[PDB]
């Protein structure tokens, strides 16, 4: 029984009038209707979830609010209550760093989107469902423990592995980030921690600018229990899949968690404007397929996608729709991108993206 | 015979936010959307139309020259000019006042830009060096009064031009004439004691704003006799805009005897508009303003300045803009593509509350001295 | 008490085009537009609104069952249908008949989806499965006559519900109540000899289609007085459209006694539509609705089929059709945040002309048998 | 004095309500108000222009409409009457391979696209003008003498080139094309044809996807005269730099050009969704200057600049305006997005990006 996580309230994210910092007359940045991370591009691999018939395959899960207390296990006290003032400016604001907003009461859309992650990872781990996938919005994993950024204003993949670890009792979680861009927050939130594996694919110093290196590994009980997969710009389905089967299965497999959550960005794709790197659906279904396989394995299935970023209206919708397809078992539509992208390349093992993975191997071993 | 225009790019990229009259707002589920109901886009349509009808080729193009304080201040308070300056100056920009209408971030400077355009544009039409012109402008301006922002407008463009032609040109006697659906209450406002502006607004009886624009609305003081409000029933048409026109705007004028007169020029009194219920066709706009024009020609040597307010109809108000456009330049080269599907919803027939809406003013005329 | 409520995905993804009403074209110079007049986000900001607002938990979602051949049949000609086939199959979609609106590539699937989601409606509110509902459709139906498409409307969705009541649930008497703004000209055409679906519509007078909606048309043969058009004139609002509730449609469903009653529910009487110059708020839809449930209630068993028609104001529609499901649910948890804004504009009292428009109707009442 | 061309209908080009390809329901295919290739790109860069002043330091040209001669310099009789046929259809419709449609009437815009590289190219061949850019819309580069292809309906730069050699009589003309697809249809018309040099620098195989190898050199007496630069994803400003430096600009001093037109697409931009190249406003910048500096050092400074693609309707203003800036020497704006993408990398040339530009230097002698 496959669990997935929808709400109407995820669409309705104020991006505001700007491409990425906001509309700017004295820098002659134009006002423009679809800012970068506007959410029709999540609405869209909703609604194709919808008239694809996949949604006759899944089980509906209600969204249910993020209490303060399930924040506080990713998050500061000082955090949460910004967000709160923030959220009841009567525009909006500032939500700390200067270049993302947030509207106006959008702290009930960030409690809708921690809290879809929180409930469907319970209603996995109790065994109510064998997996699932939480299409949430606003985005998580660049949020760290006291902050809000990268359009990020609660980190939903830690909300939801702090509620497995104290609420569920599980002793060791996952979270497997394969957004393209690094999870800086999710290292920072865990990074002291061993009972929180945290692994994070992306193209290497794409945002944020200082970060995701390899030797960013942790501290103290929790060093070696954090672990960077910098890729570089081009890299490709050939990539991705070799840092699969060398580095993520294997570092899974190592750790042997009780529950992996997925933080499960498509930015990675061939087509979005705010990364470089050349995967295709088919390259997302078998990043899915394999750490699907690999749950079964070692946790007795128990796996639970979370949405994180992805830019592209145009072919987001049928990435994520792959992974949808794998979870399900029905394989009912093509990607009708597949002939113009397949041309491009990314489908061979460069030498310098094989090194970059290559690099990762030997902190396999401090995993215990 | 030379026809002056002014279009900044600016002027398209007042940013109106994501809601659709207010802000958005979660509580009250009113979801963002891409185009607020002024979005600039509509405005910009006319402007491209103008040039893609080919137009512009005989139009003479005039640049906006940014409204200075001084400028500003012949139609508006210091603390309205300084109150735009702190609201253009937050990082986001922020509420201009009402709570409703929000100002983007330097928005001062296009709000400077559209009355300095209208400015502009009357400078050159009282020297002679044009004998009119269409300054499409955005923000629009009719709704500030002197010491405020209200309904979309920053400042009232038509105003600083009409206290430019009085206080720097040195003209005794100038008309303000606002065919914008909705009652020009900050033109009102500003020469209200005043009988050196003639101030006629047309509009939907109450449409906005909601207390405002009665008949029994003449000025003060000096000025009393010298402000005339046409409020017009829901679903007026051709026929009743041109009924006014004939029966109180064009003999007000006469009687008046302005040396120049400025038209705030809205299109949203058009069939197709959201924001009223009228029914006026781009044929229409077409008499009203040959009918202005021709007017002006007989009393003011031609001197007539049109300025943009209102219109939120992306599809429609550009055909609309395009006829009074060419009744300027006298080149008749497009038709309205609506006009078919318009032409049979009526508009055209004379009402008896109409009638009598117009004929309320009549009376009214004899103390226009 | 269990409120049925159809919306299907696909609903939102009717592909409206380029153009704005008719396509866009470069020789008229019709600028290409992201959202045509009619474009599904504003049905679709209406089913978000019934979603975020908490109405979907009091709702009962029916999935809407695709119109099968036999369905369509009992409302159109066959040569519609192989007509509709034929279109749907071109690479790019095509003309549907009348050279203005259009239908994209395989849309024979989503009109087929949106006749089926009000032919499944109706059949679990026949059972008694349900007490109620709302088919939240798209593309709209009531201009689609017996043999063509017209206005945006592929099929007559209440025809093809009511053809089904008819034939397959046995009913003698149905009546549709089409209170969109425009004339259901397509609806009047497929019952127009046949008295066993009485076929009401209220509308402004000549609207859409433009020769159309006289209080002359009345049926032929033994469907002689089983059409009632209510014409009522541009302006009317809120007074008008309650007087005519009161005076006319009410009166008629009594007289009739239906075993089903089926409203085509159109916005496009809003006091924001752009389509319309009508002056109908949220509170008027709100009336509106609460009248007719509480006659089904008293004549029927309460059984009543909501069907979307049009409806143009991405802004305010979705406000409109929330008061409609609140009234259904019985839940009134949210207010109209545009309620201040609109409610001074007027169109709350009777004018002379509009009493006297409805008044026309009232000796039709008696030939209702 | 620097022309500069817009036409209001360059913005009203009818892309239609696809992505890519035309929405399609039986692919579950969504609607969407902008597709990829929507005119608005290109306009917010027009109006940038004029906001920022720099039209204030240009001389606006009209653009005149290319006439059935000028369009047969560069194209066969059979596609200028096929794209009547097609611009007279009620709807508009298929230009001819299935993917691209032209809506009704664009062959009016078409004409005025190709005129307006002709009209300026003629200002600057004769002396009226020392350079300009040409903003024009649709593109040229990928439709061969017999057809349109890859969003565009006439070769632009083409029929640009065909009017300089046989009305202004030089002998001969190069055509620079830094859009990163591959100038398939500018390489196709010039194949046999010394007279003008073609070179074509883009992303290997990103489109059309078997065409753009080094071994594509010209035939019979224009065997030689085809230059094409193939780059891997992930290329940068210095693989760009480089590129020029060590290929282009040896490649025009050899040639001695009476006239230099540049296909300047900005879809190698680091925001660009249709290719994976990560070049910024300060890299366009220092490409159009080299290029500018080249012209003004072998054919008396003639260059005309004539748009080719370019996706990023946030960052491609910024683009444009640096080679704006670069013709009129009026450097008043930053690029915004500078911080942001400048620590994404790209500025050091990797050693697959120096082997591929170096595979190109050996074809140097033959151009004479
Ligand atoms: O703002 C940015 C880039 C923001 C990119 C956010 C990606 C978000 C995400 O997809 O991973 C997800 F979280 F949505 F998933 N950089 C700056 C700003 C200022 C100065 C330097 C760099
Ligand atoms: O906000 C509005 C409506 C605003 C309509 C502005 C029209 C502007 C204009 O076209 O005339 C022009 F100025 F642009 F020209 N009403 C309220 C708000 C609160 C309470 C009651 C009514
Ligand atoms: O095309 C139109 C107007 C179309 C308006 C359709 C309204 C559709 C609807 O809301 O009722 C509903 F069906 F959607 F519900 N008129 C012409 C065209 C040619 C000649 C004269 C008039
Ligand atoms: O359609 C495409 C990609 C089109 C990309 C056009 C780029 C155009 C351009 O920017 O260079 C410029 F010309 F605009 F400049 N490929 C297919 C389609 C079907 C099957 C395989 C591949
Ligand atoms: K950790
Ligand atoms: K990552
Ligand atoms: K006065
Ligand atoms: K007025
Ligand atoms: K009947
Ligand atoms: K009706
Ligand atoms: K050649
Ligand atoms: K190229
Ligand atoms: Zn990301
Ligand atoms: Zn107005
Ligand atoms: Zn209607
Ligand atoms: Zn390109």
């Given at each position: 029984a496959i669990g997935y996580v929808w709400n109407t309230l995820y669409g309705w994210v104020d991006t505001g009038t700007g491409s990425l910092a906001a509309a700017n007359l004295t820098a002659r940045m134009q006002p423009i209707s679809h800012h970068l991370a506007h959410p029709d591009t999540k609405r869209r691999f909703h609604e194709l979830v919808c008239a694809s018939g996949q949604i006759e395959h899944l089980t509906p899960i209600a969204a249910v609010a993020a209490t303060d207390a399930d924040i506080l296990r990713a998050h500061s006290a000082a955090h949460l209550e910004n967000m709160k003032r923030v959220s009841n400016?009567?525009?909006?604001?500032?939500?700390?760093?200067?270049?993302?907003?947030?509207?106006?009461?959008?702290?009930?859309?960030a409690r809708l989107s921690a809290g879809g992650a929180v409930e469907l990872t319970r209603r996995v781990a109790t065994g109510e469902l064998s997996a699932g996938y939480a299409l949430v919005n606003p985005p998580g994993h660049h949020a760290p423990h006291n902050a809000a950024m990268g359009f990020c204003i609660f980190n939903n993949t830690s909300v939801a592995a702090g509620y497995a670890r104290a609420v569920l009792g599980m002793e060791r979680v996952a979270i497997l980030d394969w957004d393209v861009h690094h999870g800086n927050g999710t290292q920072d939130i865990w990074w002291n921690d061993?009972?929180?594996?945290?692994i994070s694919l992306h193209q290497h110093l794409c945002f944020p600018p200082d970060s995701g290196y390899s030797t960013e590994r942790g501290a103290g009980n929790g060093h070696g229990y954090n672990i960077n997969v910098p890729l570089p710009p081009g890299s490709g389905n050939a990539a991705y899949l070799h840092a699969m089967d060398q580095v993520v299965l294997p570092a899974l497999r190592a750790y042997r968690p009780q529950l992996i959550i997925v933080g499960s960005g498509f930015d990675?794709?061939?087509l979005d404007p705010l990364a470089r790197m050349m995967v295709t659906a088919d390259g997302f279904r078998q990043m899915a397929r394999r750490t699907i396989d690999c749950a079964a394995d070692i946790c007795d299935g128990r796996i639970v996608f979370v949405q994180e970023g992805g830019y592209s209206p145009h072919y987001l919708p049928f990435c994520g729709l792959a992974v949808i397809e794998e979870l399900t078992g029905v394989?009912?539509?093509?990607?009708?991108?597949?002939?113009?992208?397949?041309?491009?390349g990314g489908n061979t093992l460069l030498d310098a993206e094989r090194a970059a993975i290559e690099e990762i191997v030997p902190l396999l071993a401090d995993i215990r």
């Open positions: 400016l009567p525009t909006g604001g500032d939500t700390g760093d200067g270049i993302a907003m947030m509207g106006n009461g959008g702290l009930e859309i061993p009972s929180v594996l945290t990675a794709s061939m394989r009912s539509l093509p990607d009708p991108y597949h002939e113009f992208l397949a041309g491009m």
